[PDB]
Amino acid sequence: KQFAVIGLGRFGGSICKELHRMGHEVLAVDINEEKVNAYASYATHAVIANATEENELLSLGIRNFEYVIVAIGANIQASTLTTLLLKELDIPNIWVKAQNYYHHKVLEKIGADRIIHPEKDMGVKIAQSLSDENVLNYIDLSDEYSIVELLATRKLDSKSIIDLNVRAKYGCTILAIKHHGDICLSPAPEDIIREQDCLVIMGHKKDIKRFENEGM
Amino acid sequence: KQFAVIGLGRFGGSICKELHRMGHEVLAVDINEEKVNAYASYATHAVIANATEENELLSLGIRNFEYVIVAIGANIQASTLTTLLLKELDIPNIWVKAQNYYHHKVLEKIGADRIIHPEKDMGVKIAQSLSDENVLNYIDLSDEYSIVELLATRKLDSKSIIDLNVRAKYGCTILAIKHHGDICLSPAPEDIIREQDCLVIMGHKKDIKRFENEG
Amino acid sequence: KQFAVIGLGRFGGSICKELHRMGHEVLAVDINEEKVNAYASYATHAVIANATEENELLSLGIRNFEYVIVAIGANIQASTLTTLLLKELDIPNIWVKAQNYYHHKVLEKIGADRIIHPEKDMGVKIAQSLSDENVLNYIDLSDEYSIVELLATRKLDSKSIIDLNVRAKYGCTILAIKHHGDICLSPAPEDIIREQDCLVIMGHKKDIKRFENEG
Amino acid sequence: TPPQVLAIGFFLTIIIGAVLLMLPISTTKPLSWIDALFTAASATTVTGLAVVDTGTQFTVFGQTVIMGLIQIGGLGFMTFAVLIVMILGKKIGLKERMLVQEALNQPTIGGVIGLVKVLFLFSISIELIAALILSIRLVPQYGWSSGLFASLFHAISAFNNAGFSLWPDNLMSYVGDPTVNLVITFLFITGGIGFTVLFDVMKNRRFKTFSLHTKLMLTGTLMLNAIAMLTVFILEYSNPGTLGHLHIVDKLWASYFQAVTPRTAGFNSLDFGSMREGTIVFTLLLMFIGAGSASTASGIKLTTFIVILTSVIAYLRGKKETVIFRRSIKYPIIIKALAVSVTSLFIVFLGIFALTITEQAPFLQIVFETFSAFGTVGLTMGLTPELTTAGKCIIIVIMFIGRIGPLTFVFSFAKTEQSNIRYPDGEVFTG
Amino acid sequence: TPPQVLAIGFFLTIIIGAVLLMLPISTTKPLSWIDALFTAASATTVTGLAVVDTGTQFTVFGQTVIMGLIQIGGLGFMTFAVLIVMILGKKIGLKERMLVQEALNQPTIGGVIGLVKVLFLFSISIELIAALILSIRLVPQYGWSSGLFASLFHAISAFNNAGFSLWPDNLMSYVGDPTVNLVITFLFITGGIGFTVLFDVMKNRRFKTFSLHTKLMLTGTLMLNAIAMLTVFILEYSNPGTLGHLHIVDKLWASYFQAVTPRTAGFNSLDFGSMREGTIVFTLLLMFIGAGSASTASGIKLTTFIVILTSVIAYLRGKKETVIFRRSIKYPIIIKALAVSVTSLFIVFLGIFALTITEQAPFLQIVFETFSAFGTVGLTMGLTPELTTAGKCIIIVIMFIGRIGPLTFVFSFAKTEQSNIRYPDGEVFTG
Ligand SMILES: Nc1ncnc2c1ncn2[C@@H]1O[C@H](COP(=O)(O)OP(=O)(O)OP(=O)(O)O)[C@@H](O)[C@H]1O
Ligand SMILES: Nc1ncnc2c1ncn2[C@@H]1O[C@H](COP(=O)(O)OP(=O)(O)OP(=O)(O)O)[C@@H](O)[C@H]1O
Ligand SMILES: Nc1ncnc2c1ncn2[C@@H]1O[C@H](COP(=O)(O)OP(=O)(O)OP(=O)(O)O)[C@@H](O)[C@H]1O
Ligand SMILES: [K+]
Ligand SMILES: [K+]
Ligand code: NA
Ligand code: NA
């Protein structure tokens, strides 16, 4: 797998550093000279080039990369013209960072394989923690079911799993407990619930909220 | 014929690509480095130079070109100073791209052989198609007569040329019919008029409009 | 005589071209790269330097020039700091181009040998020709006497010098007549005054105006 | 492609000239295919290296072909190409004008066609006048049939910086003659000073109005000839082989002649094989530097040597720019001179390396032959008649690249790399 | 002034070393004042040119002084200066740290004191280990008294790129010996690869994490030794004097040894006076290029040669920048390499010109001696014992400038020109 990242920003630079850490061949492309020099050591190859030019894009050997990431999310003209050239150049996978709803629709028309909203997806996840301080991190399996890593309160201290009727009343399944750095996968009845540690639970979205208000 | 184009814009770059396609020696002059590199392959010779300087203009051998095109239409100071040097250098043909009415008058005073308004002439032609969707492309022979390439409507389907009394009533002459990719020059009576194809007609400007509304 | 001109503007560049024409060693100093390249051929030595820096000013050998002209009249900070270094460097003659009345006073305090107002002196002379179209060019000998090069009108055509009582009535002396390219120094009575040629006269400032209105 | 037309057209004149010299009409003796190719190449590259004597091997018709190859090669292939087009009535196009810019090493196409008119008219005028001045000396010694032809042959040879001589001794019988010395030295100095330099002096009669290139050539040549004259006179004063059994007046003529001949005429008045090793080493640097960017000389040019030398001294003095005659020199001028000198030394190094493998000769003669062939000088220490068949083929390649220039030869087969991409800076210690 | 401290301190070690070698204790035979100065200069400049045999002329105490001059000169004057200050307890100031930056040719003073700690500890460690490996071979042949000292002398000599040998034949009796060949070649290759290159390999064990300078040295040395090994083996295969009367296994050892010794150790296994002229010419370019910017070698460095060569090729291909290993090279790096190469050739040209006036010798031996002396290689064709008193004084100056570097020698007496003024651009044709 050969990866090309166009645009070394906060989002683009994180992909280059993470993929290079895992041991992948990453091409870092940016129009700014200072950005390329900073990420020269964090990428296999770093080039100062303009992605809106077809002649400069062909000089990079961009046709040899299966995955090309266009991490430009503040210049719609630069982002949409870059993916038009890549779609014309028959790139199998083009992942684009969008800015707003209208930028999302333009990329969908011109053939974006995946469109990413980094700030919008984090803003929704952060606001879920702001509304309810009991949650720490959640993953939406569907629109009605999710896995929520809850935080143990004072009333749940010194409580066994069998004492909590999550399975019968709330219809939720306890998944894991992070007991002060110790992690137990699929706890068996019964385990004592300690102080403010991570409590992983699984259930319906409305059913977990009932457990937080009543049980927690 | 040796051509020099000063200013590689949307209008200037189209002249360089078209003249080089036909096989002419074209000199492309622009002050922008990126414009010259893009049109280096589309011109015989491409130079990065400022046309407002006499010393740089003489370094190009500009006195050897019969036609010099100053395609600068957003900088009046750069456009008028360029043509003043060329007029002083005795260029036989200077064609200048203008911006507005006042830019047209300055170039006329300082000796422009031809002044071109690319956006203004297209805006008039486009607005004629906007007002009447039946027309496709027209050429003004004079202020009262024109050749209009019309679009066939539904009522003209399966109609012969002799059925249409354009010659007697409207006083217009049918010139050509683009039958679905097939073009017939000077059709003879009678030819069946098909669906929405190009119908070339010739007549008075007011007479063609009567044919569009009635016929 | 070695001359140094600091600032190659419209006023500074005219001094460099005029002094080099007469055959003088002129040093042209300017902070702009394009100005120095244009006047490189019109000066003995042209240097791109900042005159506000003492280290750059000493690198030019500026202590070897008797006359230094600071032709900066739009940057008061650059003009006043330049002449302070030259006064500290014991330049015998410093001529500075000023901008306004307040710039004139600052240069007088910091030791300017001569302060020049090019636009202000021309504006007064031009306005004198605007008010009275009969005058062409005048020189003020004093606040009450001047030499005015007048233009001959229609009533002065075919008139002799003795006919005009300038000496007795107006108290003015006719100095020279530019008879259609021919110049006569100190004409003797009598010479026929032709059509609209240059008539040089000398007299009191109020006395010449009476001759223009009456004679 | 403009460099490609120069390479193809210059090589075709070698092939056409070789056939003409190989005909039985043009020669008195049977001639080898390599010697005919070497003599033709030594004339169009205007070098003067002669395996066989020009006066004896070739007839009057054969020496006329030599004059044609010298005149065509000396002024350049594209110089006469414009004249043929102008005579036939066809107008010079933009594509044809770009060929003249590449041939004359001009930066701009501004007024380059008119330069060809000036340099060709100046060439035929000064060669005709110099033939008349040499006619007053060569006619009483060789009659009217041979005296007029000898003056015409040598005036063309000297002005084009050839070094070809009809006599078996290349100007060794005119050491103390002021008529031969002054006229011939005036020819290759002015013929080698540069066509642009001559055009500037003709239109401008004041030194302060000269360009930077014109002031560099006039001052550089005067200083370089003065140092060379002092070096030859001091080193060879006590030498018994050369400059020893001569009068003080004759010592000044031979020292002056040997000072100006390696750039790049290749005439001589003293035997270079009997000179001391110290003078030969100084001659190696002397003929590695040529004269005039657009002239009849070759090798690296005098302006190229001055630009590189001043750039190093400016760096050693801590200066941030190269300044000559109170004029700054831009980076593209520096890198082009850097490319000329490095490529020239690489080709010369390959020539010395290839000749040492092939030829069995003293090392000093091999290095002297390679520098003379690359600079198109033609001075010999006694190696050119002793070259083998493989050794002669190396010299022909060296003479071909030297006249055309190392940059134009490489640009013929070097595809242009046009990429707007850049790379992050890397730190490498080059101490 | 930091270049001035280097020039004064390096010259004082020549004077101190000359007095010690001139004492009757340190020598078995009377020694001339110039030969004592030449031997002292050939040791602190770490060249290896010997007018006198080291084993016979000097005693055990005299050869101990040679080891001191080699160790001081090889690691540099300021390398041991920091150690003395650190041992005495005085802290290193900012002024003292700037001297280390100039001595090691570093661009920054960041972590330059700690580099001296690493390179000195690495030097004494690898010389002690290599002496032990050579002890298993030199002890059964020369006993314990001379066997241990011969291994200690040669391990210091090889690591510092000296070429000094106690035996009358400089490693000519160990042509087919793998123990002497592998250990000694490992010393000057690693001792000449660069202290910064060694420090990068020690801290980074992956090639992709190396710097541009480290990747240039590792790839450049491997490619340059491979080309040199093929050139020597092919050219000298049929030579009767060298590499002719040897087995195929012994041919590979001598060809490999002669490929890596001119940069810049100067050891040998074959007689360079009996080699063909083709191999000597290739050796001239081989020993004109050194190894490592901060190492025990001298001459122009391998990175300097690569930077200039790539810059010309990039210009010939139409590229607008010099790119090596996908890294752009800035203009200040290019101009510094330009200054090193031009000044080095100018000094070498003056050395050849001065030796031809003074010495009566074949021209190939004079050029070989000057390139070897300037590069501090020490390879001879048979000229160093035959040098006159004036000829030896020229070589001492050449060896002095070559070890200290042409830039640092000029900067000692070149006042800095600090002017912020600029000049208008001038057009000069450098074709
Ligand atoms: N045409 C282009 N080709 C390549 N890189 C570009 C181009 N235009 C901009 N870039 C670079 O892409 C990077 C990301 O773009 P930009 O900063 O505009 O977006 P962003 O949404 O603010 O980014 P982030 O949130 O990741 O910081 C910048 O470093 C910018 O210089
Ligand atoms: N003095 C000059 N000399 C040469 N080229 C110039 C000069 N000034 C501008 N140009 C170039 O001329 C081109 C056209 O100019 P500009 O973009 O201002 O005009 P325009 O009317 O907007 O163009 P168009 O409608 O054809 O796109 C540009 O590429 C510009 O860089
Ligand atoms: N510090 C400076 N040192 C040298 N030259 C300077 C400096 N500051 C300005 N100049 C140059 O001096 C010249 C004249 O200054 P400027 O244009 O500000 O004045 P001005 O009164 O508008 O000029 P003009 O003579 O055209 O009326 C310009 O070319 C400017 O670039
Ligand atoms: K010659
Ligand atoms: K050595
Ligand atoms: Na952001
Ligand atoms: Na003004």
Numbering used by the authors:
A (entry chain H): 7 to 222
B (entry chain B), C (entry chain D): 7 to 221
D (entry chain L), E (entry chain K): 15 to 445
In the authors' words:
Interestingly, the density at this site was still discernable in Structure II, despite the presence of chelators for divalent ions. The density at the intra-dimer interface of BsKtrA (Structure II) appears to be right on the plane of the horizontal C2 symmetry axis parallel to the membrane, along the BsKtrA dimer interface. Structural refinement of Na+ at the site (Structure II) revealed an octahedral coordination geometry with the distances ranging from 2.50 Å to 2.63 Å, which are within the range of Na+ coordination distance of 2.13 Å to 2.76 Å30. The assigned Na+ is coordinated by the carboxylate oxygens of Glu125 residues and the oxygens in the γ-phosphates of ATPs from both BsKtrA protomers in the intra-dimer interface. The side chains of Arg16 residues reveal an energetically unfavorable conformation pointing to Na+ in the close vicinity. Nevertheless, the repulsive force would be compensated by the γ-phosphates of both ATPs and the carboxylate groups of both Glu125 residues. Second, in the ATP-BsKtrAB structure, the square-shaped ATP-BsKtrA octameric ring causes a steric hindrance for the D1M2b helix of BsKtrB, resulting in a helical hairpin conformation. However, the polar interaction between Arg417 and Thr310 is interrupted in the ATP-BsKtrAB structure, where the side chain of Arg417 forms a hydrogen bond with the exposed carbonyl oxygen of Gly87 located at the kink of the discontinuous D1M2 helix. In ATP-BsKtrAB, the bulky side chain of Phe91 flips away from the pore due to the formation of a helical hairpin. ATP-BsKtrA and BsKtrB mixture in the presence of Na+ revealed a uniform species (black arrow), representing a stable assembly of ATP-BsKtrAB complex as demonstrated by the cryo-EM structure (Structure II) collected from the indicated fraction.
